[PDB]
Design a protein around this ligand. Structure first.
Ligand code: 17T
Ligand code: 17T
Ligand code: 17T
Ligand code: 17T
Lengths: 810, 810
């Protein structure tokens, strides 16, 4: 149908059809008489995956032959989503498969909905890893993603009586066609035990052993015939484990629990032993794999020339002492040489400045679980602090501030300090975030080693986040400027010369309308909820956190409702306000926020005076597959975190690429987005980081705002009195109390400017032509936020490798 | 190479080769450069399994169209062994695959050794189910095997310091190419809860739900294009199970533990809750499947016309009250009609008379786990006992003897009594066993309902147990009488006319010699143990039990050793005595017996005076795959259970078919074997059942034998004094004490006759021509012991269906 989806040749369509029938028969053991839609999906998945194998084998053979420097991206999260469409897009098979299935009497889009998301992540950090893998393959880098194959990913969110309920994400139930188990590359991982000191160095003994079994998943580059590997480890008990008899076999579950479930607590670091085990498990297994591949090329001087390890946050920080352990204890290198190798090999990416999210592991945990690693960490600390003492003589408080060991009630290890000490590069994920790192939380480290600190502004892959999810927009762009922009997003700048083009303006607006209609239909079919597709689609989708200020959005919604109720016969621009996202199961306040949103909806959506002028919908089970649907349908992107709290954001970039305007604070990547598009083409409001700091010095008093803003007072009165919860009058007392007395994120302080700015949004939306022209200016300047740019910067500035857009032979 | 292994056509060999390469590439994601022998096995397995799919789909479609009476064989055990060679044999693909792999530069026999046994059984009962499935497919019956997919089968046995060690049989580690998961046919199974009585009958409520997910495995008939299904259930937690958050997900293991491991305790009934859960799980899931298939044909009068359920022992006895529950509570049939249907549907096979093996479930267990079933069982009992009271008025002790409920310290349900009451047919597994059932343990039931009691003498499949494991013997037989005997084993009688044939005598003896050399080589390669291939191969392989009297064999071995030591320069027929088998992990005495055997070996095998005249080897990890190796190599089969204790035996039949002579008691099927071959061609010894009974009435005094047999006294003195355990003098005190004071199985009573009979064996072996002639007479009369005969008898006499040797179209 559309050009960017590839050719549907006679030979290819015929071959796809026969291989589809072959798989249905030989692979699924079905015939068309009893086959379900799910059987058809799997037949298609097997048909498509066949096209990956040759490229996958020869890419990996190519790396073995050419022996380039290898990039190892270590993460506890890879938020991949669905794989079928992405594979088709990257192999130019989409139209061919669409045709082939059509001729078989099947709707491919229907088959695509059957695939489970690989939800092996929580939000931004996990999704970033996924975009990064796509870009590394597209840029021809010898890159490997290493993580854990969780049996259960991020929970499925159900909403019951307005409350979030969690259920297990049993994503492997029907089997995963995109993985290949590699039980032959199974590796032992050690836990517990004790350290023996001998004549010939330290020895870690009496350990318990858990096996790490790898599963390989392909990562196809965009039409370059490159297929990289994401290798995920699964925990397996050894066969003599616990070996009355029956119990010993049943107890195998204990060892295998390591890879059972993804921790969903993105709000609050929990020092849970199982989480620590997960972190070491991925690190220990991965490093053996790295070293094996390096030896299959004695001399570890060349190790940093052939290996880069990127630590995605501090979660895999144990790579640093583990590498030291292997180099010193097993390979018998001297400390100083091992340390030089380690530092040159490792680099660390920070993803937050919120103190409660920082990993600070109790010493007693590390003492029991990883006794040798604790000793190594102590030695790292001593030698590091001796360097600090020499650079800043007599500065005793600096020494305690910079220590990897935190003294207190329980002694803790600061994993962020460990990462900085043992990495040659430390980066933040947006310019303002990287600056905040140097100025505040890691200031001491920056002063000691300024050369270590870099910025790498986040990006998103334009394959998933434009071509895949918004083919209509991709096509109207390709009609004017060609297809090259898909792997060179800066080319979107050429669209600036079409800002006055009447045909293009009409097409951009039409694509959005089509997307909105498609999404309005989805909501009715799958959730039986009805919306007005002519209203402004006002969306805030992201994990529920106080810092992200879904509550500020709630306050605006209630403001609009109250203004309508006051002047019912006055015209207002119709809005559909959509808020979605999961709360960490133990995050009470975030769970209360979800309940608030639904409670507002219950009042607003059933008020006859309101009509279809205002609708508030909670988007259930927000996940990658839902993002791919809602983002193309959005008109307004809510990016309203308190300045200095959102390290980057990536959702923001997805909305910008897909033709929504942004209302946001000058926080994270919003700053750079406004800079690229021009501040005139952005709806900026609220305190800057400097204003937040000023307010903190003075002391934040929420009562002041309550006293001076009558509309805000009304809302707080309504919440308190039980207007939004008639049968449980005091339901939202926790929310009110927090807002009034202990709001870390200054919701009230940005309220007036927010509401004012929202009025300017409604004003522009009344003028469809000018709304769309500003949209074109956003899309046209979204190029910088391609993860291809981000990865090219990591490659050149951190990893010391050059990207390549060159095809491998097919 | 050999004719019975099929044609190796040019077209087939070429096609097998290309499909092998296709699977290696697309399925295994490897190329020849990095492929391991295991990769090659899997490529071959996938290549062969492709040939099953068409036949499998059309067999099952055929049953749906023709709607024959369906046979459901319910067992907690299916001891399948390896599947690759069996599939090739039944599809006539063996020579073609041999050629195809040869041309690829691979040894197929080497690839075959890589396959794990499906060890989903303990011994005879489990293996019988497997032979039965093969015969039902070969005889064209619409048959389904239903059981549990254990994650861990029978433990792998390691011998360490002479002691049995158990390790987990992780048979699914590399994946199972012979199964197809069917998550679409997943069914709920209920546990716990309580019974509510309403106006409209009883209701079972507040249950916990465990999901049953089926996995289908093909059962190919012998060259008839029939492929039946063995459906095995796996336990899955529902997604809202236990749904702080992390624990709830981890607790899913509790529900899924149901299908985790096979109970190995074949010696002693353990009333463990997990085992009860397993038994109900298979029954509940299976019956829903049966009823679904029956409805997809309101009127349950026709149920017994379209359904037969065979209960393999009492393990699935809960099928009786479960069927009643469904018919009465869910379908709303009256009790009397439901009961008529149930009785006509169910049949029960008994496999033992040993009281400690009989399932007697504590009422308190059933009360908690299955409250509705207990109520149904009580009602069954009341109505049954009313029938007994009417037939035998005033006989009050009969009433308590026949009750399904046993009174005592803890009230128990006798599952065997439940099975007899609710089945239209009850059978033993050999003529003497079935007679013992009518005369002793079920005498009361026989008097009430004599028509219910039948015999179905056990059999073995001549496909696995001749063609597959002994191709050399199969071929020399086919050379004279054709190939028809393979599915009509009675044709082996034609070999009687070759008993004086000099060419045939020479060939039979040559095949045995070749088998012995092959096995002597296997022992050196895989276990580094050396044997004399010219010695008599004296083998006893079977689970270790006191009733099977491995101890009596031990006494003979020591007798031979002592006789050699007394007269060293006297000629004795050389023997390699091989004993193998697993002991249930909690069976102390059986574990002591294994240690005794190894301890004897340690003394005998290192005595220079003995030389190579006597060797004692413990065969480690006896299992189906090992049986296939050792049985063709055997000269003498030890079948020496105390008369009246071995219900049938099937190992005995395997040895008879493969050219070994039998030394045995008149127990189980040995009686019928001797009857078929002629007592002159069998080495029969020891007490008959009647002699055992006489001895019991008098009182068994082992001291009498010790006092009157000097050679026996010497052995007991040696055991006591520490001759076989120099550093632990009292090691075997338990064994001696048992033999002397509490031997239920009268080892001493058969000692003299046993030793005497063994002398006659050695005498015959000195005359190779006469040894072989007697062998021919055994093989020639082994026809009755084909499971084809057994299954045809079940079909006609119990199930009411006619077998068919007719091909389905290819
Ligand atoms: O889904 C059922 C099972 O499939 C298996 N896959 C096998 S046998 N081949 N895959 C080949 C392959 C080819 C191409 C690609 Cl792009 C990925 C895998 C998986 O190893 C196993 O984990 C899974 O449960
Ligand atoms: O850089 C990518 C994105 O990273 C995010 N960080 C996230 S998702 N941390 N999760 C941490 C976490 C901690 C513990 C657990 Cl158990 C789970 C998740 C930033 O908030 C966002 O601004 C940025 O764009
Ligand atoms: O081995 C990896 C996985 O394979 C899967 N098999 C699939 S996708 N097709 N099988 C088709 C098939 C065809 C013929 C026959 Cl005779 C048996 C199965 C199994 O369902 C799964 O349990 C297992 O782990
Ligand atoms: O008829 C086939 C064979 O059946 C055998 N019975 C067996 S293996 N019972 N296992 C029982 C059992 C009980 C509990 C558990 Cl957890 C495991 C096994 C007979 O002993 C044998 O004579 C006969 O030939």
């Amino acid at each position: 149908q559309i050009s960017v989806r590839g050719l549907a040749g006679v030979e290819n369509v015929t071959e796809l059809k026969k291989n589809f029938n072959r798989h249905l028969h030989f692979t699924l053991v079905k015939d068309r008489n009893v086959a379900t839609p799910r059987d058809y999906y799997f037949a298609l998945a097997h048909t498509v995956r066949d096209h990956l194998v040759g490229r996958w084998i020869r890419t990996q053979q190519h790396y073995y032959e050419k022996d380039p420097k290898r990039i190892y991206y270590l993460s506890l999260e890879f938020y991949m989503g669905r794989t079928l469409q992405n594979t088709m897009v990257n192999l130019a098979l989409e139209n061919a498969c669409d045709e082939a299935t059509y001729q078989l009497g099947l709707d491919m889009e229907e088959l695509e909905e059957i695939e489970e998301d690989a939800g092996l992540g929580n939000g931004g950090l996990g999704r970033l890893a996924a975009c990064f893998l796509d870009s590394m393959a597209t840029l021809g880098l010898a890159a490997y993603g290493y993580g854990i194959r969780y049996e259960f990913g991020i929970f499925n969110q159900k909403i019951c009586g307005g409350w979030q309920m969690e259920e297990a994400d049993d994503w492997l139930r029907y089997g995963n066609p995109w993985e290949k188990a590699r039980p032959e590359f199974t590796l032992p991982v050690h836990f517990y035990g004790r350290v023996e000191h001998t004549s010939q160095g330290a020895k870690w003994v009496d350990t318990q052993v858990v096996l790490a079994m790898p599963y390989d998943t392909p990562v196809p580059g965009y039409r370059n015939n490159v297929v990289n590997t994401m290798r995920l480890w699964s925990a397996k008990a050894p066969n003599d484990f616990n070996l009355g008899y029956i119990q010993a076999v049943l107890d195998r579950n204990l060892a295998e629990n390591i890879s059972r479930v993804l921790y969903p607590n993105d709000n609050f670091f929990e020092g849970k032993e199982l989480r620590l085990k997960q972190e070491y498990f991925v690190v220990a297994a991965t490093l053996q794999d790295i070293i094996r591949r390096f030896k299959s090329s004695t001399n570890f001087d060349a190790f940093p020339d052939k290996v880069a390890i990127q630590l995605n946050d501090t979660h895999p920080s144990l790579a640093i002492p583990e590498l030291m352990r292997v180099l010193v204890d097993l390979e018998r290198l001297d400390w100083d040489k091992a340390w030089e190798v380690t530092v040159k090999t490792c680099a660390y990416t920070n993803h937050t400045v919120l103190p409660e999210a920082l990993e600070r592991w109790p010493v007693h945990l590390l003492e029991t679980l990883l006794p040798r690693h604790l000793q190594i960490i102590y030695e790292i600390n001593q030698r590091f602090l001796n360097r600090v003492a020499a650079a800043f003589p007599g500065d005793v408080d600096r020494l305690r501030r910079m220590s990897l060991v935190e003294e207190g009630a329980v002694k803790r290890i600061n994993m962020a300090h460990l990462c900085i000490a043992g990495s040659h590069a430390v980066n933040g994920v947006a310019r303002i975030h990287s600056e905040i790192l140097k100025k505040t939380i890691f200031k001491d480290f920056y002063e000691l080693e300024p050369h270590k600190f870099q910025n790498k502004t986040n990006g998103i892959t334009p394959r998933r986040w434009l071509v895949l999810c918004n083919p209509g927009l991709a096509e109207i762009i390709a009609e004017r400027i060609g297809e090259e922009y898909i792997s060179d997003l800066d080319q979107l700048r050429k669209l600036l010369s079409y800002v006055d083009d009447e045909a293009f303006i009409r097409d951009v607006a039409k694509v959005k309308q089509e997307n909105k209609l498609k999404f309005a239909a989805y909501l009715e079919r799958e959730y039986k909820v009805h919306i007005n597709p002519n209203s402004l689609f006002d969306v805030q989708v992201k994990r529920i956190h106080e810092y992200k200020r879904q509550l500020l959005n709630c306050l605006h919604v209630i403001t609009l409702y109250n203004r309508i109720k006051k002047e019912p016969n006055k015209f207002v621009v119709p809005r559909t306000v959509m808020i979605g996202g999961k709360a960490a199961p133990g995050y009470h306040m975030a769970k209360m926020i979800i309940k608030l949103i639904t409670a507002i909806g219950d009042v607003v959506n059933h008020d006859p005076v309101v009509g279809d002028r205002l609708r508030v919908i909670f988007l259930e089970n927000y996940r990658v597959s839902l993002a791919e649907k809602v983002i193309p349908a959005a008109d307004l992107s809510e990016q309203i975190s308190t300045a200095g709290t959102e390290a980057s954001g990536t959702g923001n970039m997805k909305f910008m690429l897909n033709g929504a305007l942004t209302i946001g604070t000058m926080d994270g990547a919003n700053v750079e987005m406004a800079e690229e598009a021009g501040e005139e083409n952005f709806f900026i409001f609220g305190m800057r980081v400097e204003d937040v700091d000023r307010l903190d010095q003075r002391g934040y008093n929420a009562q002041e705002y309550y006293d001076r803003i009558p509309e805000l007072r009304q809302i707080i009165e309504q919440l308190s009195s039980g207007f939004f919860s008639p049968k449980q009058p005091d339901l939202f007392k926790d929310i009110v109390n927090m807002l009034m007395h202990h709001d870390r994120f200054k919701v009230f302080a940005d309220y007036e400017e927010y509401v004012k700015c929202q009025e300017r949004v409604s004003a522009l939306y009344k003028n469809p032509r000018e709304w769309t022209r500003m949209v074109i200016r956003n899309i046209a300047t979204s190029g910088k936020f391609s993860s291809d740019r981000t990865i090219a910067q990591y490659a050149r500035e951190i990893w010391g490798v050059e990207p390549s857009r060159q095809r491998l032979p097919a």
